[PDB]
């Protein structure tokens, strides 16, 4: 998270850390008692690495009574996601057992009404990804308020030259942005999950290249079909 600040510990009980071989790999959001939503590209190069989800965390390293590491029983990436694109970049992770809900572990409602967020809206994005232009990561969770940016602008050749579909959305990336390691994390407007970070292989903090986020409402049918 660029241009952000440290979050209030355990104020986002849906915040998940998708972990690979015990290291933070990607952001996530607990969308059901036994399911975690994240980005599909996180796992693209993961190979045989042990996939686990960290719930109830603020510090990746320090003891907290809420922190719990769950093994993943089954990883479901959106069937139409491929490494060559940013389309359908969603991944569902089934926990070994249902999570122990509490004031620091709670699932988050996701937007089901397929309507764009009004441009200029300040949405909250959190994560453990890069905090500075030097590519270094924080131990405890960061967050930043970003204004939504209209698709037409985001699609200008200066910016993402037509990559933003009706199924995706942008936020302004000037000085404040989502970086590598924030992918799969949540974009929140009106305390309802609106999007999922898909930063991938984009350099952050440059206003010329807005932040991209997958629209959860565009994949409502899919999410339920997996969660059934």
């Amino acid at each position: 998270i660029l241009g952000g600040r440290e979050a209030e510990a355990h104020a986002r009980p849906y915040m998940a850390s998708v972990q690979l071989n015990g290291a933070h790999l990607c952001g996530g959001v607990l969308v059901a008692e036994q399911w975690v939503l994240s980005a599909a590209h996180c796992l693209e190069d993961a190979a045989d690495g042990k996939v686990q989800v960290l719930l109830g965390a603020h510090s990746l390293s320090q003891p907290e009574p809420s922190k719990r590491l769950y093994d993943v029983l089954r990883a479901v990436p959106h069937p139409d996601s491929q490494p060559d694109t940013i389309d359908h970049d969603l991944l569902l992770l089934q926990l070994s057992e249902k999570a122990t809900l509490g004031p620091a572990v709670r699932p988050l409602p996701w937007q089901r009404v397929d309507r764009d967020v009004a441009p200029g809206t300040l949405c909250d994005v959190a994560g453990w990804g890069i905090v500075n232009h030097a590519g270094r990561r924080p131990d405890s969770l960061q967050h930043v308020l970003l204004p939504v940016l209209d698709r037409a602008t985001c699609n200008r050749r200066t910016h993402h030259d037509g990559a933003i579909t009706e199924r995706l959305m942008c936020a302004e990336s000037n000085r404040r942005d989502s970086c590598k390691g924030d992918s799969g994390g949540p974009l929140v407007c009106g305390g309802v999950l609106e999007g999922v970070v898909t930063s991938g292989s984009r350099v952050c903090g440059n206003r010329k290249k807005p932040g991209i986020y997958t629209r959860v409402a565009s994949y409502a049918a899919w999410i339920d079909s997996v969660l059934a």
Partner: antibody
Amino acid sequence: EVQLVQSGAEVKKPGASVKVSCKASGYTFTSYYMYWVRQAPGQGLEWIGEINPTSGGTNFNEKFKSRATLTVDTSTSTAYLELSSLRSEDTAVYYCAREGGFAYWGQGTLVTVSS
Amino acid sequence: DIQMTQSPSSLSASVGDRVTITCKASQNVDTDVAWFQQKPGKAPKGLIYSASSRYSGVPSRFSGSGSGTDFTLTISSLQPEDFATYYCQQYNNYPLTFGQGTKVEIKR
């Protein structure tokens, strides 16, 4: 298939206003900006301006801001270019072109301003 | 505004020649540069965007280079269908600007 279908050629007297239409099909019209270019006979290309279909917001080249108007009918996915108070210098081929993705352009509308 | 000074204005070449068309931005325009081909009585055709990337369906013989102020369109092996007018375009800063054009003619 994606195509930008522009309006027919125009012959106008040197005081009037012309309204060139450009209907887009094959893509989400609102997803992209639409820009407009002018090419006078045996001359180069001139950027006129652009329109955001979602907001209706425009960005013009100062040269045209004064007599040019850019509008959008989202219900019919059509971008319009209105050039008013015409003179013989306005005689040119006017093109609408998509701003973003594959370089799609209209066939071009010829405006001829003569007394 | 930002000026795009295209060079040369006219160029005479044979079929199979390597051909260079240069564009000079009066200010840094990063890689926000495009190239168009235009044949007589026809609309411009997109060739290159992002100074180096080719549009889908554009033959491999067309290539773009440059970052900043000096940009180049190269035709590795000139084909008959390539004798046209080429135009560079800047999309970094408002207003978007074009070059005066380069007409490629058959040398005899």
